[PDB]
Write a protein that binds this DNA or RNA. Structure first.
Lengths: 95, 264, 85, 101, 64
RNA sequence: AAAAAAA
RNA sequence: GAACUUGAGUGCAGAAGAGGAGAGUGGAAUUCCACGUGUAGCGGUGAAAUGCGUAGAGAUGUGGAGGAACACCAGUGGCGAAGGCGACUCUCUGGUCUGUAACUGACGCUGAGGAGCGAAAGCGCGCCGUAAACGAUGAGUGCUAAGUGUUAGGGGGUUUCCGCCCCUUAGUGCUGCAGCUAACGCAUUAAGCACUCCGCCUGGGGAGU
């Protein structure tokens, strides 16, 4: 497997109780589909340099992983449908 | 280092005498011309520098914000130079009206009375008011009559020194370039006019490219952009572009250096 | 992969060091071709890869042909192991 | 009573329009060089754009604005004047944005 | 006219380091050309990608 | 062209 | 027959790319319609006329044609066999170059036919199958003054590194020999000097009939 760098903005209109639930959900998604989480920074609420879905700020999470496609693609799948995650990107790292 | 020390001493003397409330000479720098600055603000929005403020109530710091952004850009020398050309000159006065370009409320020149008459008066008023203690009404009325006429004069004697100094410099630059007719130098478009564009070298020597040497196209001046645009080619010579020029002619008496464009 | 490729070199190699034997190279190509065949089943329009394919295919055939003149026995062994006509 | 808004300036070669909105693009006020009675070459000029912006802006301050995003359209000569007319009317300019199609 | 990245020995530009990237965009937020910023071609491409991935993630603006 | 400030 | 490694290729180490085929998303934009603000012009240029109009237009949003491309970066820059290929991300996949030689040991080259790819094409995605689909210059290899630039590299030099300096490789440019050309020109990216193989030409028109 190969090292990816998930990043995603949670919507700014949630408590720290509901935030952690999102974080736990999507870390659990990755590790449920054969991933491992190697790092997990939290940038905390920055200003968005434009307006995504009528929010001017949001909560950056940055998940490093190692996984196969399936894990990352499943994340990708679920990170669309979800209304908590407003934008994201998977990225392949310095391999 | 010396600059800053002189500045604070000049700041500290001024402030002491403003609170004393006796007749004294100040070095003032008024707010820049609101029309000239309006034209300066436009010019910088073309390069994308967006200022906060209006031309009738600019704080000095806002102008510094521009000069920090352009630092180590090609545009620097000219936006620098174009801001300048919106500033007022500093003059002496008897009233405390503040110094815009040091962003202070109290300033005088104290630190060079060998070579400035206003400094030499500051030394006499200091000896009059502080050392001797002569703060009587007749002493104050004497100086309150005399300082408006000294301030006006000495101001005009400074501007007559500067103009003259510059006019010897420009003569000796031109004298420098008489043996460099034919030579190719890299430079930077310092100014653009309806009749041509000026180019500054890396030793600060300035020369004109007259439109009559721009033989590749019929150039039209665009006043808003500050540019010479070709009608056919679509070549655009702007303020702040780097260009290579060749020396065509040098007239020492007139203080003219004429250039032609080799390439961009 | 490069692990897979290391299997295929160990399997076919005619002695310890060897990676340049046709058997080797052919083995290697054979897999690539197989894997690239697989790609083109899904990606039928991927013309540029197919061009690749044809070349691999070709490189194979010449090797095989070289082998098949050099020493027939080795040729025979190989083609059965891999499953080539 | 809304505070934040956008000042949609259209500067054509004929005319300068200035609409001022709320963030959901509902129209607070507007003016134009033509609304102020300028005609022909005058409507193009940056002075007419300046005056257009002031009239639009003074309409907006009645509804109680303070901060303006600016959106500029078109190639006309107004945008630079008309923006400093918004700053000079009082309203602070956060960011401008050229949205020429 | 020296390259930032060759100078400081930076082999990997990171779309998350916004405060670096902002050195290479205009105030409008258009990318600055290579002949202005001194950047090496090699890095200009990398830089170009980063900024684009930044902009997608709303770390930089498309248009200030 | 065109600013402080220095000299 | 045997042997060898310089051709060719596989290893191993390293690099760049808008190469391609999928999946999704990003901001723009455009202008279609319904709809919320909106308040008379806007728009038309000699500058009005011509238009076009408070039924609220110009102008401003939410749905929207939903179909088409990716502003800056952008460079005779890069990549591909050609036609070409420029948002970003992800999946799958092709080719190229550099370095060392661990191995292989001539395993190569060209290539009619054939097969595949292949414009607006022309017409029912299929079919069309040709295209200045002409730097008007087959492919492969070797040899034959220089100078300079750039893209991806390699080694050395001091170098903290950077740095600049130099040799070398592959590609892409500009000048310029020798030679060649009818001349124009070309000139280590030859149109020079050689060799192998392929396509093609033999007055114009009639006639691509």
């Amino acid at each position: 497997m190969r090292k990816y760098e998930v990043m995603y903005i949670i919507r700014p209109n949630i408590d720290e109780e509901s935030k952690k639930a999102v974080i736990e959900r999507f870390n659990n998604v990755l590790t449920s589909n054969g991933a491992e989480i190697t790092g997990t920074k939290d940038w905390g609420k920055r200003r968005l340099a434009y307006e995504i879905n009528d929010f001017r700020d949001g909560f950056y999470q940055i998940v490093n992983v190692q996984s196969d496609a399936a894990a990352v693609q499943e994340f990708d799948r679920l990170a669309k449908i979800s209304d908590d995650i407003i934008r994201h990107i998977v990225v392949k790292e310095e391999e | 280092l010396i600059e800053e020390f002189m500045l604070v001493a000049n700041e500290t003397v001024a402030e002491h005498f403003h609170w004393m409330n006796v007749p004294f000479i100040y070095r003032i720098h008024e707010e820049p011309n609101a029309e000239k600055l309006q034209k300066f603000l436009e010019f910088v929005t073309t390069f994308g520098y967006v200022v906060k403020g209006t031309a009738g109530n600019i704080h000095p710091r806002a102008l510094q914000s521009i000069l920090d952004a352009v630092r180590d850009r090609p545009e620097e020398t000219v936006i620098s130079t174009v801001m300048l050309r919106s500033m007022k000159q500093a003059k002496y006065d008897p009233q405390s009206l503040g110094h815009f370009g040091l962003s202070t409320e109290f300033y005088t020149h104290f630190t060079s009375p060998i070579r400035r008459y206003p400094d030499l008066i500051v030394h006499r008023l200091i000896r009059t008011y502080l050392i001797n203690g002569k703060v009587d009404e007749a002493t104050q009325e004497k100086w309150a009559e005399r300082l408006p006429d000294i301030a006006e004069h000495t101001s005009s004697m400074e501007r007559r020194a500067v103009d003259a100094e510059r006019e010897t410099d420009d003569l000796k630059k031109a004298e420098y370039m008489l043996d460099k007719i034919g030579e190719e130098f890299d430079g930077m478009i310092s100014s653009v006019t309806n009749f041509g564009m000026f180019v500054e070298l890396p030793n600060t020597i300035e020369g004109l490219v007259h439109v009559s040497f721009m033989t590749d196209d019929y150039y039209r001046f665009d006043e808003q952009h500050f540019a010479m645009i070709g009608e056919r080619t679509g070549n655009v010579f702007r303020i702040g572009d780097e260009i290579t020029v060749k020396v065509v002619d040098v007239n020492k008496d007139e203080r003219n250096i004429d250039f032609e464009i080799v390439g961009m | 992969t490069q692990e897979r490729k290391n299997q295929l070199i160990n399997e076919f190699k005619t002695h310890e060091s060897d990676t340049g034997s046709p058997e080797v190279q052919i083995a290697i190509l054979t897999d690539s071709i197989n894997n690239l065949n697989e790609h083109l089943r899904t990606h039928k329009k991927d013309h540029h890869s197919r061009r690749g394919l044809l070349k691999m295919v070709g490189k194979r055939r010449n090797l095989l042909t070289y082998l098949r003149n050099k020493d027939v026995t080795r040729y025979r062994e190989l083609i059965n192991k891999l499953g080539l006509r | 009573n809304i505070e934040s808004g956008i000042a949609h300036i259209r500067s054509t070669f004929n005319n300068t329009i200035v609409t001022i909105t709320d963030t959901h693009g509902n129209a607070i006020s507007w003016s134009s060089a033509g609304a102020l009675g300028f005609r022909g070459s005058r409507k193009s000029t940056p002075f007419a754009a300046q005056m257009a912006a002031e009239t639009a802006a003074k309409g907006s301050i009645e509804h109680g604005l303070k901060t303006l995003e600016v959106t500029v359209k078109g190639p006309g000569s107004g945008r630079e004047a008309a923006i400093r007319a918004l700053q000079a009317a009082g309203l602070e300019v956060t960011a401008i944005r050229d949205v020429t199609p | 006219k020296v390259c930032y990245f060759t100078s400081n020995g930076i082999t990997h530009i990171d779309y998350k380091d916004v405060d670096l990237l902002k050195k290479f965009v205009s105030e409008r937020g258009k990318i600055l050309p290579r002949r202005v910023t001194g950047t090496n071609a090699k890095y200009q491409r990398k830089l170009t990608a980063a900024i684009k991935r930044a902009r997608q993630m709303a770390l930089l603006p498309y248009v200030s």
